[PDB]
Amino acid sequence: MLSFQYPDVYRDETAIQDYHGHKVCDPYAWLEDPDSEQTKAFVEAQNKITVPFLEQCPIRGLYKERMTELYDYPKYSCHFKKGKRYFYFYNTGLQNQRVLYVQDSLEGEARVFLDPNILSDDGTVALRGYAFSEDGEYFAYGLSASGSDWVTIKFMKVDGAKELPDVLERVKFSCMAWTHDGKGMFYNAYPQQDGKSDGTETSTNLHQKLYYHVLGTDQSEDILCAEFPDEPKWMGGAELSDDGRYVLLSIREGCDPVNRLWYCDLQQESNGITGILKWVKLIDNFEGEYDYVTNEGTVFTFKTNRHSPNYRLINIDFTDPEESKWKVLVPEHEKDVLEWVACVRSNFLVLCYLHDVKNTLQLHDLATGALLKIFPLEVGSVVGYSGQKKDTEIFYQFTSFLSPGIIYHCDLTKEELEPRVFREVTVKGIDASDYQTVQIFYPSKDGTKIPMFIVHKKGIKLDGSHPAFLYGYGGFNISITPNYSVSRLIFVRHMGGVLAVANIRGGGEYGETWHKGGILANKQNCFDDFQCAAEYLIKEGYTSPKRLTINGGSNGGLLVATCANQRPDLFGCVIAQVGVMDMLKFHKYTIGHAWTTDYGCSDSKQHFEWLIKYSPLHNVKLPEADDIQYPSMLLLTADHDDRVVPLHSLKFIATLQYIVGRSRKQNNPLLIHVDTKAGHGAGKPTAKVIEEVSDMFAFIARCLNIDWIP
Ligand SMILES: *[C@](O)(CO)[C@@H]1CCCN1C(=O)[C@@H]1CC[C@H](C(C)(C)C)N1C(=O)CCCc1ccccc1
Numbered sequence: 031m032l033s034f035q036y037p038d039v040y041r042d043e044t045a046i047q048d049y050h051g052h053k054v055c056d057p058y059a060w061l062e063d064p065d066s067e068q069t070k071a072f073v074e075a076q077n078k079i080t081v082p083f084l085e086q087c088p089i090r091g092l093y094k095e096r097m098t099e100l101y102d103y104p105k106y107s108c109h110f111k112k113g114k115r116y117f118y119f120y121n122t123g124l125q126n127q128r129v130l131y132v133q134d135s136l137e138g139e140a141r142v143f144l145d146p147n148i149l150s151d152d153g154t155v156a157l158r159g160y161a162f163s164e165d166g167e168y169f170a171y172g173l174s175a176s177g178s179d180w181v182t183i184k185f186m187k188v189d190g191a192k193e194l195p196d197v198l199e200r201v202k203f204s205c206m207a208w209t210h211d212g213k214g215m216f217y218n219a220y221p222q223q224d225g226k227s228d229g230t231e232t233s234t235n236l237h238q239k240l241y242y243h244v245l246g247t248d249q250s251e252d253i254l255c256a257e258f259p260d261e262p263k264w265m266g267g268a269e270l271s272d273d274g275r276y277v278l279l280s281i282r283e284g285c286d287p288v289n290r291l292w293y294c295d296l297q298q299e300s301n302g303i304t305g306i307l308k309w310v311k312l313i314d315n316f317e318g319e320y321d322y323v324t325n326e327g328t329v330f331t332f333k334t335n336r337h338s339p340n341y342r343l344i345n346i347d348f349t350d351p352e353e354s355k356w357k358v359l360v361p362e363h364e365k366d367v368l369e370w371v372a373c374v375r376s377n378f379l380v381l382c383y384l385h386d387v388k389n390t391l392q393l394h395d396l397a398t399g400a401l402l403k404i405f406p407l408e409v410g411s412v413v414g415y416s417g418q419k420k421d422t423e424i425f426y427q428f429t430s431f432l433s434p435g436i437i438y439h440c441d442l443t444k445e446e447l448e449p450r451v452f453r454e455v456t457v458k459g460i461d462a463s464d465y466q467t468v469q470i471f472y473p474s475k476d477g478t479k480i481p482m483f484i485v486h487k488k489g490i491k492l493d494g495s496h497p498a499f500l501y502g503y504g505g506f507n508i509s510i511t512p513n514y515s516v517s518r519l520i521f522v523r524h525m526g527g528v529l530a531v532a533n534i535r536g537g538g539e540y541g542e543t544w545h546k547g548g549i550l551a552n553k554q555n556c557f558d559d560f561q562c563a564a565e566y567l568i569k570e571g572y573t574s575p576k577r578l579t580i581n582g583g584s585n586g587g588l589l590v591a592t593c594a595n596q597r598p599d600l601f602g603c604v605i606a607q608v609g610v611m612d613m614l615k616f617h618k619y620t621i622g623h624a625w626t627t628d629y630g631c632s633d634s635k636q637h638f639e640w641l642i643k644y645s646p647l648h649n650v651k652l653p654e655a656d657d658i659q660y661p662s663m664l665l666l667t668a669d670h671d672d673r674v675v676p677l678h679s680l681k682f683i684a685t686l687q688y689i690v691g692r693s694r695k696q697n698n699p700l701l702i703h704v705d706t707k708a709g710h711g712a713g714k715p716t717a718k719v720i721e722e723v724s725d726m727f728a729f730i731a732r733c734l735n736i737d738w739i740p
Pocket residue numbers: 203265282283284285506583584585586610621624625673674710
């Protein structure tokens with residue numbers, strides 16, 4: 031099968047660094063420079079062997095045609111009301127980017143409000159963040175080019191969709207919050223830096239500042255309202271309280287779900303907003319999360335994890351602020367994770383819990399916390415919601431493994447609350463009734479029970495004959511919940527596959543104790559959990575090692591790359607998307623410093639000792655056994671991925687191809703594809719999504735020699 035040669039790639043054998051006494055060689059360090067002729071030539075040589083490999087077999091075309099056909103269905107957001115008008119996002123099916131629509135009534139004719147598709151030929155300019163003024167008459171929105179985290183904020187007057195001159199540059203990881211006087215908006219920006227700021231650079235992002243922009247002015251007049259020059263990693267995000275009286279500042283450092291909470295009573299400002307605000311440091315440490323829900327005068331309701339790993343709701347009175355005085359409004363549940371909360375219709379709270387990786391939605395009274403109404407849902411996820419304090423109705427969107435999504439509406443003025451199907455769409459071609467979802471709980475190495483979802487065609491023999499696609503992430507308190515994937519269901523229907531998603535430690539499925547179980551010294555639990563998931567599928571007869579594919583993105587790309595290294599005999603195929611591969615240097619680039627809360631940092635001897643043991647870049651080793659090789663491996667990245675700089679995948683594939691690729695016994699291909707005008711994934715246009723999944727399943731099909739089933 032291996033009918034190509036790996037490119038020649040220079041090894042700088044002088045690149046030796048000391049880490050607390052451990053000499054580490056980094057011969058591909060030079061790939062850290064994206065702009066060098068040498069790096070650009072490496073990328074070209076790699077894509078030159080990958081693309082033909084992927085496009086040789088007729089199955090890529092079959093898959094791409096079936097994907098294009100089945101992905102072609104109406105895709106809606108929830109309606110949301112802003113001032114006098116309703117808005118919703120809608121894609122007719124195959125538009126590169128969804129379009130924002132407006133209508134003046136829920137029953138009236140909608141018209142295009144903002145259409146990103148016209149800002150590029152190829153859909154690579156995307157919306158990234160927006161905020162309407164409190165009255166709904168003005169609109170701010172962020173645009174990113176080529177998948178970069180960098181944003182430009184532009185502005186419109188809603189009536190007539192009129193473009194305004196205001197443009198805010200150097201926006202990244204930013205809040206967007208209008209003061210209720212309609213005068214201007216808070217946002218975040220980074221100081222100027224040498225070299226490029228377009229998504230191709232690797233330069234670290236530090237000293238993020240909080241600014242206020244007055245509408246109708248140039249950015250250079252913007253007011254600096256908060257900054258932390260002694261704490262270059264601190265990021266201060268602003269929001270206004272529901273009554274418009276207070277600015278709330280959530281200062282983060284790293285990805286841990288914790289924040290300082292400062293406030294500014296805007297009425298107490300000496301002459302409106304003219305400089306650094308008179309911040310009151312309500313919570314001035316990083317011990318807990320405080321997520322603003324609503325207030326009633328000085329009584330502020332927050333979702334918190336303080337003393338509550340599964341989260342709870344507390345009331346802090348600004349006039350009696352000590353911790354011992356706080357009221358517990360809705361206590362922590364013993365198992366169920368309180369994911370998010372919203373206040374609607376003045377005195378209702380909407381609460382969304384995660385119960386064994388499935389969502390429930392409940393309505394509660396604001397005054398007492400008492401449960402009032404359960405909104406009935408099938409097994410799956412709530413992935414969209416609208417309804418804020420002033421609103422008298424909610425919309426919410428539900429999805430699962432086997433159904434695209436239903437949007438419900440519920441009129442909260444009604445004595446009897448009966449939610450109703452507002453929009454529902456049928457993907458004809460994949461009959462949901464042909465398949466089943468099961469959830470099982472398997473023991474990991476240390477005996478911890480891990481959930482796993484398995485989706486498969488009804489009445490299959492568990493004889494180990496099926497190809498399988500096992501997905502994980504495992505990190506950053508993120509829960510991996512049921513979602514509708516056309517691309518995955520084709521694998522099932524047309525490649526006879528079994529799909530699995532393992533809810534490994536590191537994620538948020540069981541609150542902070544679950545997150546804490548997959549970070550720092552205990553990161554290895556994630557990899558152990560994920561290996562055990564594979565072994566469960568094998569032992570139980572869903573698949574065999576030779577037919578098993580694993581997949582993960584970002585922190586999940588780390589997960590699958592590490593698993594490739596640690597248990598190469600367990601997997602036939604590995605697809606690592608935009609993965610963190612160099613665990614010794616991740617912190618040096620763009621926003622990487624923020625991930626040390628999950629990973630630790632190599633500057634510390636203790637942390638270095640954890641990291642060296644699983645860092646994919648540092649653990650490529652020919653398997654000792656003669657009969658064991660590395661799985662077929664495909665790394666996917668893109669030249670504007672400034673979330674996870676592509677040097678991670680570049681150095682890793684260079685190492686895979688040298689250490690393992692050159693051995694006689696290695697016949698499984700080790701490839702990388704580096705896309706252009708794309709980044710980490712968010713905002714990727716439909717055309718690129720389709721190319722991507724076609725590439726991935728074609729790789730699987732060729733490596734495992736899977737027949738297409740029409
Ligand atoms: C991928 O796993 C996921 O895209 C990469 C690689 C490691 C972590 N990671 C992220 O993107 C992290 C995971 C949490 C967070 C969000 C945006 C997905 C919630 N990540 C960030 O990098 C956010 C960066 C900006 C930031 C920093 C601190 C606090 C808030 C936002």
